[PDB]
Ligand SMILES: Nc1nc2[nH]cc(Cc3ccc(C(=O)Nc4ccccc4CC(=O)O)cc3)c2c(=O)[nH]1
Ligand SMILES: Nc1nc2[nH]cc(Cc3ccc(C(=O)Nc4ccccc4CC(=O)O)cc3)c2c(=O)[nH]1
Ligand SMILES: O=c1ccn([C@H]2C[C@H](O)[C@@H](COP(=O)(O)O)O2)c(=O)[nH]1
């Protein structure tokens with residue numbers, strides 16, 4: 001339910017502590033939160049504020065492809081990673097000789113080629129590294145009671161090579177009574193900008209994997225480490241905090257897909273999405 | 285407070301689902317829980333049941349040394365890893381040519397040498413891999429507002445070489461108002477046997493790091509993925525569930541220590557620990 005996210009926002013606004021951060025902004029921060037969102041006959045796309053669903057779908061397909069090039073996602077119309085891959089930002093991190101748009105070894109590279117030696121974004125890493133995503137799919141297919149169905153994106157060796165280290169760093173899957181659930185550990189949660197996006201992203205991943213493995217989507221457990229509200233997000237969120245939540249939409253997959261790499265953007269349809277208008281919240 | 289662990293126990297006994305596991309036993313399972321334990325002027329060593337504190341301290345010192353040899357921990361009187369390091373078990377996982385007691389690349393090897401090529405338990409891995417523990421200590425010392433203070437033991441590349449994959453796979457640290465807090469993500473939680481041990485283990489790690497960096501211990505947030513109670517632990521836990529909890533003890537560090545490697549077992553003293561008698565809960 002969306003009241004969990006709204007309650008987390010209210011709790012950070014009422015009990016969070018003022019804390020500096022890597023960017024010039026400030027935050028109201030709280031350490032350690034957990035919410036639960038049902039995936040049964042509904043999709044947790046927030047209704048108190050319109051969420052960039054096209055960005056969610058395109059960025060998840062971009063993760064599944066193992067791509068770390070921000071230009072490949074920007075060509076689809078999703079510019080969420082163009083800022084963290086811009087020339088000025090890479091220069092601000094010392095990567096002066098790094099090609100523009102190369103985010104380094106990030107979510108997709110760790111999902112599909114964990115442990116492989118990262119060269120650049122144009123390299124072909126076929127057959128290299130550890131393919132975590134296909135491993136969790138096969139584990140769900142052959143041993144659903146396994147307690148190690150984990151995809152981890154935190155790689156300390158590749159950490160100083162990343163433009164932005166993973167925020168949703170680890171996720172675990174769980175199967176019971178033909179229901180597939182997913183828990184996400186998010187080390188850093190931009191409650192206004194990034195967190196609803198990550199909620200929808202991992203709910204979509206759970207739907208995809210449940211479609212492939214013949215299971216029904218269960219719950220999505222969102223665990224947060226440093227859940228923070230930026231200052232330029234205080235007044236916007238309060239606006240969102242005074243809107244009546246509407247029922248969640250539904251996600252329908254239009255064709256039967258066997259492999260996760262064969263999913264395309266046209267295979268997904270959002271039904272009954274009636275959100276309140278968007279609320280601009282600038283990135284840090 | 286200890287009532288959080290007891291509440292998780294009660295919630296698993298009343299709402300858990302029957303689930304098979306890797307072992308021959310069964311479990312009452314729940315996916316996704318989170319508890320908060322205060323470290324302010326108290327140490328969360330459970331009082332409704334005596335916890336093997338000597339094992340906690342010696343195992344944390346064994347992790348900090350980067351050791352993967354179970355015999356080095358057994359020589360101190362802690363035989364918790366002898367079962368997963370026995371000849372029959374190593375043979376049950378295919379490691380026929382592996383010396384007995386060699387757990388493979390596990391918690392200590394990932395804490396101190398992430399990414400290094402694992403040879404055996406007798407090898408000297410100085411300078412190899414990524415030293416995550418010292419990196420998080422330096423980060424706490426120089427940049428406490430950092431949101432990337434993470435120590436991760438989940439290595440998919442070294443995963444098929446481990447006798448037992450990490451259960452407490454990832455932890456994150458957080459600093460505010462000169463208070464150091466720690467969150468742990470445990471993918472698999474043996475609620476009867478292992479979870480009380482891991483609570484004290486990570487509380488002690490937080491105390492050590494707070495002592496080194498000159499901070500005060502704050503909270504320990506225990507997040508659980510698959511939190512399960514084994515069947516042969518149902519009736520024992522009920523006994524523990526009807527005991528009146530006593531106040532938590534205190535942890536005192538007897539001398540000023542500069543580096544984490546310089547800690548010794550004689551440096552720590554538990555004060556005021558008056559637990560109820562132990563309750564036998566056999567390992568699976
Ligand atoms: N500080 C910081 N850096 C980040 N780097 C990467 C991220 C993740 C992320 C996730 C989602 C979006 C997003 O929905 N954008 C968008 C696009 C079109 C229209 C409206 C919006 C939202 C709005 O501006 O109202 C952007 C970024 C991120 C972050 O959240 N915070
Ligand atoms: N199923 C399963 N396998 C495991 N492998 C590793 C762990 C972690 C862990 C953590 C703590 C202890 C512990 O206090 N033990 C203890 C206490 C008193 C007397 C004898 C023993 C040892 C024993 O009874 O065997 C043992 C194990 C673990 C687990 O918890 N469950
Ligand atoms: O999927 C994502 C990507 C980014 N962020 C936000 C969290 C932080 O506000 C910022 C990352 O900054 P560091 O915490 O690494 O300093 O991006 C998210 O919430 N979700």
Ligand SMILES: O=c1ccn([C@H]2C[C@H](O)[C@@H](COP(=O)(O)O)O2)c(=O)[nH]1
Nearest residue numbers: 147306451452472473474478479482
């Ligand atoms: O520190 C530890 C180590 C092990 N376990 C338990 C969790 C599981 O019940 C068992 C390992 O089996 P798998 O979950 O990996 O199948 O050990 C813990 O709770 N804590």
